[PDB]
Amino acid sequence: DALKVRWPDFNQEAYVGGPYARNKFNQVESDKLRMDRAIPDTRHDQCQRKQWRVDLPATSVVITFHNEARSALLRTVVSVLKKSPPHLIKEIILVDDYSNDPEDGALLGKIEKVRVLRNDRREGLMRSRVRGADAAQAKVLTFLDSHCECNEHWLEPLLERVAEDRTRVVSPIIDVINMDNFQYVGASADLKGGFDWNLVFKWDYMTPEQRRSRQGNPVAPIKTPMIAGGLFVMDKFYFEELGKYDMMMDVWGGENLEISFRVWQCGGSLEIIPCSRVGHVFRKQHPYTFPGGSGTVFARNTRRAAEVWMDEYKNFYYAAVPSARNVPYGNIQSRLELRKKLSCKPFKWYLENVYPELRVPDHQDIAFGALQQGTNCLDTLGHFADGVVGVYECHNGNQEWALTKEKSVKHMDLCLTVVDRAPGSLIKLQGCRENDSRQKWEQIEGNSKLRHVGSNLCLDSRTAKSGGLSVEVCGPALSQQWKFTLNLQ
Ligand SMILES: O=c1ccn([C@@H]2O[C@H](COP(=O)(O)OP(=O)(O)O)[C@@H](O)[C@H]2O)c(=O)[nH]1
Numbered sequence: 001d002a003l004k005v006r007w008p009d010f011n012q013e014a015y016v017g018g019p020y021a022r023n024k025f026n027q028v029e030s031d032k033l034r035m036d037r038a039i040p041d042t043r044h045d046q047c048q049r050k051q052w053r054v055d056l057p058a059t060s061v062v063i064t065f066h067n068e069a070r071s072a073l074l075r076t077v078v079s080v081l082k083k084s085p086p087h088l089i090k091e092i093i094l095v096d097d098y099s100n101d102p103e104d105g106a107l108l109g110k111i112e113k114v115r116v117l118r119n120d121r122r123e124g125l126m127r128s129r130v131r132g133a134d135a136a137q138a139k140v141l142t143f144l145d146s147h148c149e150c151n152e153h154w155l156e157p158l159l160e161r162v163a164e165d166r167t168r169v170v171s172p173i174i175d176v177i178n179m180d181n182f183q184y185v186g187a188s189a190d191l192k193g194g195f196d197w198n199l200v201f202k203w204d205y206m207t208p209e210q211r212r213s214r215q216g217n218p219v220a221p222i223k224t225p226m227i228a229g230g231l232f233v234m235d236k237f238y239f240e241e242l243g244k245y246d247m248m249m250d251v252w253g254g255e256n257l258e259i260s261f262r263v264w265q266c267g268g269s270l271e272i273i274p275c276s277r278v279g280h281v282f283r284k285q286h287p288y289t290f291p292g293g294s295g296t297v298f299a300r301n302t303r304r305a306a307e308v309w310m311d312e313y314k315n316f317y318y319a320a321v322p323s324a325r326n327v328p329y330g331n332i333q334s335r336l337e338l339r340k341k342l343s344c345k346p347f348k349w350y351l352e353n354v355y356p357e358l359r360v361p362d363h364q365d366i367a368f369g370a371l372q373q374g375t376n377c378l379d380t381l382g383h384f385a386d387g388v389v390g391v392y393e394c395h396n397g398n399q400e401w402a403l404t405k406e407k408s409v410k411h412m413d414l415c416l417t418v419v420d421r422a423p424g425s426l427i428k429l430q431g432c433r434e435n436d437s438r439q440k441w442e443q444i445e446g447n448s449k450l451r452h453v454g455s456n457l458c459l460d461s462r463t464a465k466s467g468g469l470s471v472e473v474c475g476p477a478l479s480q481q482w483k484f485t486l487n488l489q
């Protein structure tokens with residue numbers, strides 16, 4: 001009481017008083033804002049006129065960080081204090097993950113509710129959050145980054161879900177805070193988290209069912225196959241019972257793959273609650289804002305996740321990302337045991353029941369995915385009947401093909417056919433025929449091109465503007481370069 005103070009009385013000027021380098025976002029602009037700057041109510045009209053049960057269990061807010069911009073950190077803390085019912089916030093625990101300046105977190109202990117923990121050494125987000133979860137005294141946990149901003153009644157909608165079902169790991173729609181001007185922008189409420197075989201976050205359109213349910217309830221919560229960020233609410237016992245976080249992961253990976261697989265495969269579920277909104281400052285090429293991400297992944301954490309939950313399906317990930325096979329990922333022994341103990345379901349269960357919309361190749365396919373040449377993708381051009389095939393610039397995806405065990409390159413039941421084998425002859429998309437020789441292809445030169453079996457003809461673009469892909473005599477030309485997204489070879 002004598003050592004604490006209300007946030008309105010907090011001296012933010014002095015705090016911030018003692019531009020991209022230090023944090024990969026405009027710090028100069030961050031400091032211009034007041035710790036309690038106002039933000040737009042990005043909620044759906046429906047949320048506005050809604051009541052929440054007063055008996056919602058209080059929560060402990062755990063914010064973990066490593067060298068964060070003071071303005072951003074502070075703005076996050078008061079964001080919580082001001083935007084949520086004081087009685088639902090047992091405490092705000094700040095885990096200073098070994099920041100160069102102890103004071104960044106220290107000086108905030110003066111504020112009501114804020115307790116701050118420090119680390120002897122850099123421990124990373126996974127360990128720090130575990131530390132926080134343990135020091136927490138509430139029954140429910142709320143994890144947030146050191147650079148977020150809570151909106152109107154963001155918390156109740158999340159607590160409502162967990163109270164109802166301890167096994168629900170709920171997240172708010174994550175709004176965007178511009179890293180250059182900190183304008184607070186609203187994200188969609190009609191997209192789910194997903195991924196491709198290279199295990200990189202991807203956005204998805206809602207499911208038909210989900211859509212109907214939205215016709216009924218416009219702000220209805222929706223299940224999500226892949227968590228989209230690091231913001232979420234969860235039961236403390238359930239968090240521990242399920243295995244907390246994989247303490248052996250490192251600072252780079254997407255620990256989020258592992259957390260999403262484990263929740264789903266082990267009984268729980270993941271939900272996105274539209275009425276809940278929390279702004280987040282995304283770095284340059286963050287996957288949430290830049291499709292495909294930056295295009296670089298230090299595989300450790302991705303392997304750790306794949307090797308523990310995907311069963312035989314990890315080979316697809318490895319088909320899309322060979323290099324990852326040669327990336328060390330440490331011991332996953334205790335994790336495989338946690339899975340054993342928890343008797344979680346297999347991945348095949350997950351693909352079929354949680355993320356069925358992810359097209360999985362046939363176990364006997366030789367290669368699968370989009371057929372790319374430079375940034376262009378092989379496309380039927382919508383000519384699904386004895387038609388000429390061509391290319392469209394790929395969509396970051398689009399049209400998938402399969403190099404089947406029988407040596408065919410098909411799109412459903414249509415095969416690329418070598419109608420005429422004289423150089424320059426256009427190929428055609430036709431109904432696949434079991435033993436038909438005009439439909440047999442093989443990869444050569446390290447899966448960098450497609451030759452027509454029993455000939456010296458290769459699939460070529462040269463004629464694209466003259467009528468479509470054709471078969472030319474294999475050569476150096478780059479219009480003969482083709483790559484499947486994943487190769488099981
Ligand atoms: O306890 C922590 C919290 C954050 N970070 C580092 O701070 C950066 C941003 O963390 P965050 O989880 O917000 O990642 P983002 O969502 O921006 O990609 C990363 O380099 C983290 O690995 C850390 O090392 N330990």
Ligand SMILES: [Mn+2]
Binds near residue numbers: 145146147
């Ligand atoms: Mn973040």
